[PDB]
Symmetry: D2
Subunit: 463 residues, 4 copies
Amino acid sequence: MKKTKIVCTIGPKTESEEMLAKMLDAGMNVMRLNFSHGDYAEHGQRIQNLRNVMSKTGKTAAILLDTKGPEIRTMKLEGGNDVSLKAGQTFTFTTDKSVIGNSEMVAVTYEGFTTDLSVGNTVLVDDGLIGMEVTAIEGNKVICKVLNNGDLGENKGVNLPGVSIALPALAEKDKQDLIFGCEQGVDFVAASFIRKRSDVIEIREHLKAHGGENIHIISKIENQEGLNNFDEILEASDGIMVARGDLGVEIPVEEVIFAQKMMIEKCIRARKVVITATQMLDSMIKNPRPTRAEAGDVANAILDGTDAVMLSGESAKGKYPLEAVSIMATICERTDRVMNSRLELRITEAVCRGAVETAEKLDAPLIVVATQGGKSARAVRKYFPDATILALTTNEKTAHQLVLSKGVVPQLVKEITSTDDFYRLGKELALQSGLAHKGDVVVMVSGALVPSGTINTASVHVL
Amino acid sequence: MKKTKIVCTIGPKTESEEMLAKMLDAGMNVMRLNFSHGDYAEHGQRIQNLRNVMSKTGKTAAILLDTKGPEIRTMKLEGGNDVSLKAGQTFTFTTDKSVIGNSEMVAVTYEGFTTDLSVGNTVLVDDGLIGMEVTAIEGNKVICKVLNNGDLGENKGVNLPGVSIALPALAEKDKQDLIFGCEQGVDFVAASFIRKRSDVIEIREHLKAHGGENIHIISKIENQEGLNNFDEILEASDGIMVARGDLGVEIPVEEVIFAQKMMIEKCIRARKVVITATQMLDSMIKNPRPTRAEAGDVANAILDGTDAVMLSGESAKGKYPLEAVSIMATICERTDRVMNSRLELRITEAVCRGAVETAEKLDAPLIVVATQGGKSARAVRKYFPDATILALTTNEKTAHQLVLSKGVVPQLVKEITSTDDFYRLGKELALQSGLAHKGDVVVMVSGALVPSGTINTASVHVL
Amino acid sequence: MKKTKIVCTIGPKTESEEMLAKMLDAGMNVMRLNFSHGDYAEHGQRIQNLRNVMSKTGKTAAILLDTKGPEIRTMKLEGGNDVSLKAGQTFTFTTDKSVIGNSEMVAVTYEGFTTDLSVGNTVLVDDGLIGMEVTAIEGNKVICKVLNNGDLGENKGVNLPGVSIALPALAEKDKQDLIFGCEQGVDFVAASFIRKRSDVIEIREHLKAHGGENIHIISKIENQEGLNNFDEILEASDGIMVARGDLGVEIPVEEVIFAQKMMIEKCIRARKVVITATQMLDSMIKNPRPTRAEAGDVANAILDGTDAVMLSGESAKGKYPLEAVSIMATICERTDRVMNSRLELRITEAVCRGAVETAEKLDAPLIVVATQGGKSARAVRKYFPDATILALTTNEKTAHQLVLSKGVVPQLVKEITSTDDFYRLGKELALQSGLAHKGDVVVMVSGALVPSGTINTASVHVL
Amino acid sequence: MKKTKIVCTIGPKTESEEMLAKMLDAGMNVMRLNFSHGDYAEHGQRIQNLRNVMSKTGKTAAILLDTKGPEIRTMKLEGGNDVSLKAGQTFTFTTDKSVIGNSEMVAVTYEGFTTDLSVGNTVLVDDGLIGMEVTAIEGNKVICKVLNNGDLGENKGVNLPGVSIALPALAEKDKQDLIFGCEQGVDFVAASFIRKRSDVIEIREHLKAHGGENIHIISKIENQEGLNNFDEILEASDGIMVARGDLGVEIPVEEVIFAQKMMIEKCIRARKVVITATQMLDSMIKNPRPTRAEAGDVANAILDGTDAVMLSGESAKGKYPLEAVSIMATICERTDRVMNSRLELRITEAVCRGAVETAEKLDAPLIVVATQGGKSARAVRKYFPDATILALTTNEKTAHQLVLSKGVVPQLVKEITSTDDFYRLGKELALQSGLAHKGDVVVMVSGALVPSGTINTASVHVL
């Protein structure tokens, strides 16, 4: 079966226990809650429904909370009517939130709009529909030249390519949503619009103050500043979400593919999970089959080395959610099938790399790893083993979180008290899992006489 | 500058000499004539305009004739009105060309429709818009069950996934178009819907009977039968066009990416040019910028190893042809920039592989190759050299055809009569080309005391 | 310190406890008792003296009993006077032991002399001093033509190059000497003139009949038949002694070097100990320093990969025994210093090869191995690790025997009852041994949940 | 056939044309004239006889003149009688040449004996037979303590281990012998006791002053100072002779093997010929077969990579000269047979390394090299090609000198005027040589459009 993991955004058409059970059957591994919409009762019910399905079926899934994040948006227009902007005309943005807009001026929600912009910068409105060039800044106004014809509606997103925007790391709504995440015991938080290390630290401190210190932070990289600061963002985060659609509006289009490839590569080296998201199978919101191009896009992200792929509207509100998951899983299995190990100085990396190499040389279908916080399992996954990884842990949070790592099957166990006990138990559970059978070789990895989080032992057993 | 070559379909908005000159400036290397449309005067004028621009500017380009090919199409409907087909209804195709269609039956243009199909086969209509399952075949009728709702218009294409269709290799119109190609001295013919070796042989014999034995045949692989017979098709052809859009309708969608990757890989090994085509930058027919996904699709085809990428409607009839070529070239240069050589038993391969390796070890910016029919230049290109390839030939047809090979700069010369003369002339032309300068190392490859088409000499010179 | 081990033949000048202690100080690892001479009281006293020194100093050494073996020798001559044989003359050997020899005929000790020889065979007398060609065999006579001038003395050795000699595997005296060796608890038996597998088996069955089932048999390869049957001899033996001087008389002289190299390499591959012996430092029987040629010969044997080197007359009866051992150790250390690991499918070899590689990648000075019969320690030594091997065993005989393996330090312990206990103890003993210090990395190898003799675990610890 | 070349010292028993022809038949490649003995008429006659044999048989050989060199020797003793010196006694050397020696004092031939020695230095007499330690130096006396018992004869050699001796590079007799060598057109001069760069330069300037600028200088490395200065000596020389016997007296005995190995490896890297000499087959001066130890020593020198091996007394004055040469050739062929190429930034090394690799990948039995001074042929030999090297040259001296390089067959030709002419001629000569046959692949190496001594072309041809 596939190794790549599937994140599904859950919404009205997929929130019932019946639908969720069918989603898991088709290959869903992680439920994404998009807090751009819905209230707390709605999201809490979805969590309840999934956990009901999990306990009834004994299947394991993880829950990811995806924040709305801070934004720059235009505001209202006279009579609520769209206005037609003409290439070459003058157009003005104002930070005065009380102003109602027309064909010459509109208000924006961000007070720092005048401060952060410079003459010559580009202002993009409505997912890049309309481009403008700043010609002057005076008082609370940014005067611009419209670069292309377009119709401006109300409440449209604004992008400032290449600008360092002094928006807070968290909207006030985001802060309450994170408390809800701690209350609900979510496994991951995907933090929107991460631009710098200090953004991640604030989210870390906020989660810690509400008992969520074990919740993993997935930073969403969406603009050039986040790209420039990627190394420090990754270091402070537990993982990364590559938001291709936002990057497509924020950086030169020919760069987006290499931003994805390099971010995936760096996450792999850092033993941190990476999700490829947005613009995956969007056409399946309306159609029962994806496009050739969409299928290729998904497969190339897997070949790039992503841990997981994500469905958005096509699983949350679209008309063919089950078809989308199913064809996603089919693409995953077809692509995982043809990938090879990557066997390219620390004790943990020496032992994990050697264990994968030993497994391949002995045709081992399974690597068994003892792990407390999941690091051990991710250190083996780094080398793209042909073998499946059976991760044994006493930590429920770790067991849920490892559901997102490529090719990892987590298993919650009663604590193992010695290295020999780990070999005895792992052999039994290897057989019980159906992932290996009598006579198969399995490689077992653990830490002996060391603090948690260090791997220093590799062991080969016949079942 | 980029190494990947760009094929541009030329049409009304790009056929003037002024536009063509701007197309070349932006990165166009090969003009495609799509004989699905236009008459002979129209295509002949485009050839004349390009050759005018070539002689005036001294720039080199190639001309590719892309055949319409044989087809299966539905026919007319009552009153010319679309009809609404309902999932589950019975629907019948008839080979009786005299029948006017309605919501229950329509005629098809192919007499063998009844012969080639079987109960259980899938019939796709209008680029897969409507799917049907054959339930019975009687006389001149194929009775089907409609699988999904759809509106059937007139004269729509029909696809039969996984069926071996006994259509001729060439439509009658194709045969006359090939004579026109010989009359005009085109450099390539892209042959539509190639399914088996004998299809290529017929085209070869037809071209030979009209003085076109030196025209290279690019076989378009569009369905499962062509995939199954790919090895023999490639062997008989001079190159391959990967028609992704057609494959998307003809084979399981998760397979299309690997059909592309494997066909490119095999062409590379066979020293035969490969073009990746269709569904590249289609959105630019209407928009001045492509989508993030389109840009990624193009770049991944380059990383796969394609020689060339192709523009269709976006350069022929679209509103932003120059923008499309320019961003295509930008993607090409950005992607070529980060690719590495591939240095993985015949004398020619031993010498060409060694020459590339020597060039890389000595930081040679240029490999100079003496070639008669172009094979030598393509044998060096096989290893993806960092260095540019300067191909010297007395053969005008070869000089034009090498314009399509990745990273090859062709140069027509007066015949060289000895190996030492080749070193003297190549050094001078190396400097004149501006591709290398005084003090640079260049590696020079040629055949000494051997029949044309064998490479057995490698030589290193300082300019 | 050196890794190559030194076998010293002990005699009158080196048998006292005082001399033995200084021999160990200078680098002696194994005492060889040459049972060609000395009676049981003398050899028993030497064994007692070594064990006294071992108990007093806490040093570990092994005891090797070297059998005389079967021989063919000429007999006596008239008046005990030498005779001069002439090239081309007729000379006859007779199996009649009652015959007194002269310049025309002499007796030999072996009844099968007539049976095993053929017309055309070469008969060599006195370490090849005199060659003869069989011209006829009649009754108890072998008639020969003398091939070269020489002086024949009494009681000279006879060699039959390329002939299969049907001598018994054991002389009658050898059988009693082996029983004495079992009584005394020797660690190795070196069996002279091993020609075939059955010779090794016969010695094994004799030892088993007198409680010597754990004594390792080192087969001495001395002639062409042993070379021809080497693979089966090695398989049946525990180790090999390369007797270069004897081979130099039995096979073409240009082949001896490659016979030594081939045999050493095969022993390494089989994880079986090999000794290089004879014509090592013979000149030091009379001189206090060896020859340039001798020193080079020894060093090249070490570079070939021998486990051990052996002193014969120069440590047993010569005038400079301590100088011989000391310069030998100097050669060993000087040559071992510049040798590298050899890292090249069984579980044991996969784990042991990986453990050596891990040790080298982490600059581990020490590999700790748990072993019962020594196989595990010898499996690590196979890869010529930079690190010293500390072999922990509960088996006293194994501890002695491992003294002969290159780069192994054995240590007798109280049995370890678990894998974690093995790591705790090995770390302590690593520090106690002085072979590693606080902060050093050590790699520990053992078998977990497997029968003795299987290695399936590798573990990395910081001291 | 062997690739390693054989230098034979010619003397009374091997000087006739008849013997020389049989010496060449048996494997001799180079004649060494040891000018320690013989007068000019004798050496001139030997040169004449070899050239007669060469012209009659068409075989190619080289002539090497080996200088006596400077020495320190003791002088005469009272009554010409040996004296016995006692360990611990006082013994004095005096530079007063008029003094007649006895058991307490003897004269030496070198005035600088007092200057170059220091209190604590070791004085060795008679190939290290007797060691003495300087205790004081006063006037023309070196007072020593005898370190070991020994018998002092007259006119014995003196060695000063680790001392820089200020002897002139050339004895007065050496200067005349070198002029004679220039007059006679010898191909090599072997310069004895080279200690430093300036010694090589002095010999060079003498040869240049008498028309010997093309004679190659082989520096004999014989003591520690030469070892210390080896890199600069090699740089200044054309080749090296490793004098193992002399080094065995001057440096620690365990170091001699690695001094030989290091020096051979460095010569290979520098593309300069190396000879292994002294203590090769000395026992064959009296015996018709060598010792096991001698044969092994020679073979290990070949495996180390020496170009040539040298016979001294055993071919010049011994009783079995032809047997010595023959068994030497047998050892050479037996050892060369099992050696492999060594394929490891200049243009010459890139092209030559690639040519060897191409030859091996294509099973080419022959590499043809165009060379003026021999550098090109020696640059190919550096990689130990399986193929034989056919070196085409117009230079008679180069043709002779290349006889000493491993695996090179030189061939004198009429000048080639182009690269294509070189391929035509080399193919013909490849076939004429019997080293390759119809259908074989040959690789041809030369310089095109470059000054002599640059190699920049590699070419592959089928015969």
